[PDB]
């Protein structure tokens, strides 16, 4: 029955490539080492053809390098501060959902040009002093076009159709599953284009690269209150990408990010490789040579 | 098991010959194809102006200099005002196509230098900030038929390292080895069709990695010519022509 | 009321826990999946793509010139052209590589590496280079006679402008920590030194200096272990 399915659920190890035993090759016309990098093809030279190799039955597992295992890890995608003290006596915050505000998730995602994934959003909410009193919060997903709340009391919080999570700060972090929500067949971290037609002659070309296919709306968070609580709440949002398809691998960003929704670097271009003294300098003392 | 150095690319009424080729790159192993009914979303019949749009358009020649930093184009943009392609790309809202990009740079056996010719899908151009200066202008994002000189080829004008641009479909033009670079690129997008004016599906970078060095008496004007051919151009959404 | 007993680990949010979670949208059917060229499923497939080594990562050199290994006609014999270590997670030339940047998302690595050197001189420029990989234990070889005792290739410039130096997996452990330095030089892969086997010989009216472009990649037996956070880009404030 289904016991066969449950048995084949553990991750079976897939091993790296074995090395075959090789011998010396003295001849002409067989040049496994001469390549042509101009072809855009990487070298197909094997260690069995450059050196005399032994037979290694390689049992190293290559599973952890999957796109799933690389990406199915919850990282901080949003820090929301529900301000209800001082000058900002709001008790609610409407947060634009963007997973590009923090370096670790953003850099990992931009390894890919297109990604199609579901997500497991977790909300870690606490006070300034790390404490978690019983405080009912509402976590309303406001999809693009839905009325956004303008107060802690406004009618939008009735969440008749919007998905809302109600949880106290004392409860374990609210965690939900988000599907692949996009008019496109994949999210697009790099959109070489403009969302609208026009001349695009504005002094601030703010719309370059802004694909509305990634704009998935706003997370509207409030404390379920009747007046100012006097407490600021820090909600931290962690996305765990799952069921992930990645397309068009890209270079991992080498320059420090500056803004959220734009590739933009400082004129002080940092070298992708740390500098050394000369092209003949290495940082390795090694052992004492037996006969220099 | 060899790659022949001579090659002839023939599409439409255009034929490109090379005698120093370097094994044409088929981007991501996938030839350009028309949109399968399974992946199509628009319901209008697409136009397929096969021979009038799928053909080699020679579009720009850039003089390679010793201090040259490189140039980039955007594939639909570089053809949006050229031939029956540009007219189909203006009259139609939806467009999809692959391309065969043939970059031509020949020099003597006494010149040296290597060019990195790469086809970058979704080549979002960055602005270098020391606000209005935070985003690149339309001339840098869509340079057109002329292309744009690289400001910082090291970071590809995108913040990403040039040394990893070989993750994209690329060839080299090493002057001692080859005088051309051919990249066949299918249609890459999260959408089956898209606007040829709003969206640039691929960037077309030609960056000198090893600089052009010659001696006194050698031809100083070593040009780089970009010839691109749409492949399987479909156009839907016929309306008034928009530039 | 089925009798249960909560064990330690209840209410914890382990960020790497692959568990179920309640769907926010019942009945949601996503946009149909269409074919997009270029799907990658493994980061090992990306580590096998040859990317340029920044071997000229020297103080003063800027830009694309950091990618070039200068090679010129020598007045002496058996001189060192360039050297670099082959620890893919070490600060240095491998930082500019896809393999060296995907390694830094992992704690331990294993497998043969590969540097593809492309000569970018004139067709009339001839030469022969000895590119030696020195296994651990020895510092950078001081002479070519000492370097040729290790895994090396003699590279003849010609119509095939590129050569591959397969850095073989020569390790005591099955895996090597990506972290190097200190006691973690227990995992130092070694040094690669480029030597002039013969001279860089050019005819008259031909440039006497040229450039080797190194291309670092991984072999088919390359492996990565223990996903970790990379040390590449830092952040002090949220980006908008």
């Amino acid at each position, epitope marked *: 029955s289904a016991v066969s399915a449950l048995a084949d659920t553990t991750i079976s190890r897939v091993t790296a490539a074995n090395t075959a035993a090789s011998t010396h090759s003295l001849g002409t016309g067989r040049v496994p080492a001469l390549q042509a990098a101009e072809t855009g093809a990487s070298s197909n030279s094997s260690d069995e053809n450059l050196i005399e190799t032994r037979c290694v039955m390689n049992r190293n597992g290559v599973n952890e390098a999957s796109v799933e295992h690389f990406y199915s890890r919850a990282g901080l995608v949003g820090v929301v501060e529900v301000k209800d003290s001082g000058t900002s006596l709001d008790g609610y915050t409407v947060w634009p959902i963007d997973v590009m505000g923090f370096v670790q998730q953003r850099r990992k995602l931009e390894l890919s040009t297109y990604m199609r994934f579901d997500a497991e959003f977790t909300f870690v909410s606490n006070l300034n002093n790390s404490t978690t009193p019983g405080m009912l919060l509402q976590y309303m997903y406001v999809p693009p076009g839905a009325p956004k709340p303008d107060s802690r009391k406004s009618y939008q919080w009735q969440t008749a159709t919007n998905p809302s999570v109600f949880a106290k700060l004392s409860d374990p972090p609210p965690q939900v599953s988000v599907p692949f929500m996009s008019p496109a067949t994949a999210y697009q971290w790099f959109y070489d284009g403009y969302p609208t037609f026009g001349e695009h002659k504005q002094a601030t070309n703010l719309q370059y690269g802004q694909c509305p296919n990634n704009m998935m709306g706003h997370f509207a968070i409030r404390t379920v209150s009747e007046s100012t609580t006097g407490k600021n709440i820090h909600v931290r949002v962690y996305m765990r990408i799952k069921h992930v398809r990645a397309w068009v691998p890209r270079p991992l960003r080498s320059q420090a990010y500056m803004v959220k929704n734009y590739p933009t670097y400082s*004129q*002080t*271009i940092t070298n992708t490789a740390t500098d*050394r*003294a*000369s*092209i*003949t*300098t290495t*940082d390795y*003392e090694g052992g004492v040579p037996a006969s220099p | 098991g060899y790659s022949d150095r001579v090659a002839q690319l023939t599409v439409g009424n255009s034929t490109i010959t090379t005698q120093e080729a370097a094994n044409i790159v088929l981007s991501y192993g996938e030839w350009p194809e028309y949109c399968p009914s399974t992946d199509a979303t628009a319901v209008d019949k697409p136009t397929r102006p096969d021979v009038s749009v799928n053909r080699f358009y020679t579009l720009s020649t850039k003089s390679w200099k*010793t*201090e040259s*930093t490189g140039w980039y184009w955007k594939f639909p943009d570089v053809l949006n005002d050229t031939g029956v392609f540009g007219q189909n790309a203006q009259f139609h809202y939806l467009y999809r196509s692959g391309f065969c990009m043939h970059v031509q740079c020949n020099a003597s056996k006494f010149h040296q230098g290597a060019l990195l010719v790469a086809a970058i899908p979704e080549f979002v151009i960055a602005a*270098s900030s020391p606000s209005q200066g935070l985003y690149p202008d339309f001339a840098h994002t869509n340079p057109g038929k002329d292309g744009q000189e690289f400001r*910082d080829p090291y970071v590809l004008d995108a913040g990403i390292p040039l040394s990893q641009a070989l993750i994209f479909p690329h060839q080299w033009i090493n002057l001692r080895t080859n005088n051309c670079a051919t990249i066949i690129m299918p249609y890459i997008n999260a959408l089956p069709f898209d606007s040829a004016l709003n969206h640039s599906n691929f960037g077309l970078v030609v960056i000198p990695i090893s*600089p052009l060095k010659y001696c006194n008496g050698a031809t100083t004007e070593v040009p780089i010519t970009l010839t691109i051919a749409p492949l399987n151009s479909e156009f839907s959404g016929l309306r008034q022509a928009i530039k | 009321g089925f009798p249960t007993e909560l064990k330690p680990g209840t209410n914890q949010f382990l960020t790497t826990d692959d568990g179920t979670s309640p769907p926010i949208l019942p009945g949601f059917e996503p946009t149909p999946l269409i074919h997009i060229p270029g799907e990658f499923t493994s980061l090992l497939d990306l580590c096998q793509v040859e990317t340029i080594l920044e071997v*000229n990562n*020297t*103080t*003063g*050199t*800027t*830009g*694309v*010139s950091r990618l070039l290994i*200068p090679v010129r006609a020598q007045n002496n014999v058996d001189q060192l052209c360039a050297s670099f270590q082959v620890d893919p997670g070490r600060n240095g030339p491998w930082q500019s590589t896809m393999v060296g940047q995907i390694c830094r998302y992992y704690t331990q690595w294993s497998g043969s590496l590969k540097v593809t050197f492309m000569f970018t001189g004139s067709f009339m420029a001839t030469g022969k280079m000895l590119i030696a990989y020195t296994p651990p234990g020895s510092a950078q070889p001081t002479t070519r006679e000492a370097a040729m005792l290790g895994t090396h290739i003699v590279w003849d410039f010609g119509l095939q402008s590129s050569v591959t130096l397969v850095i073989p997996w020569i390790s005591n452990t099955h895996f090597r920590a990506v972290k190097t330095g200190g006691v973690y030089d227990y995992y130092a892969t070694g040094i690669v030194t480029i030597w002039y086997q013969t001279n860089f010989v050019v005819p008259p009216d031909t440039p006497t200096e040229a450039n080797i472009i190194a291309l670092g990649a991984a072999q088919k037996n390359f492996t990565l272990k223990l996903c970790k956070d990379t040390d590449e880009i830092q952040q002090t404030a949220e980006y908008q």
Partner: antibody
Amino acid sequence: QVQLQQSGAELVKPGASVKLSCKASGYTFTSYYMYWVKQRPGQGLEWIGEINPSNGGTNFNEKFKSKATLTVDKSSSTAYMQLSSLTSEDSAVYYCTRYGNYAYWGQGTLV
Amino acid sequence: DIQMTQSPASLSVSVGETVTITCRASENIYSNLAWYQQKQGKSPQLLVYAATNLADGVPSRFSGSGSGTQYSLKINSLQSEDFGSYYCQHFWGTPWTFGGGTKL
């Protein structure tokens, strides 16, 4: 070879500014930083600052930030240093140094 | 700012002796040291780059060695023209602190 030709000697009245030149030759100018070193006669060498001939990025010492301005003419392959607020402690020999893999120095400029 | 500390501030030896200058550093400069020989009147001539690479034209009598914090320049078979001032110079980071100097 890699020759850095600095400007001629300078004799400027106090409270002024002089534009010292450094016409690089023999290498790609936009590929190496240009550094300036100050040496009062008898005293040692003092590093003024750097300039990248690709973005104008200049990093001076804490004792020369408001006393030296570095520019570059990428078309002319020439670097410049215009010492502002000239004094007596600013009368010295000035060199332009490129390092890369080999420290190349100019000839100097008496100021 | 990684500052320098050149140990021998002055030295006077005869032709044939072997003088060894020392150039410490505040922090590890990673072989980013250059020794110069400047005789008053001429321009600073580079002797050893990267703390070990003998510059072009410099006689094999000169030798640079060291790693990390401590570095040493040795002049074996001290010929006649080996007089003047000897400056070490770190080129690791922002300050680019030169050496104090060594009269010889």
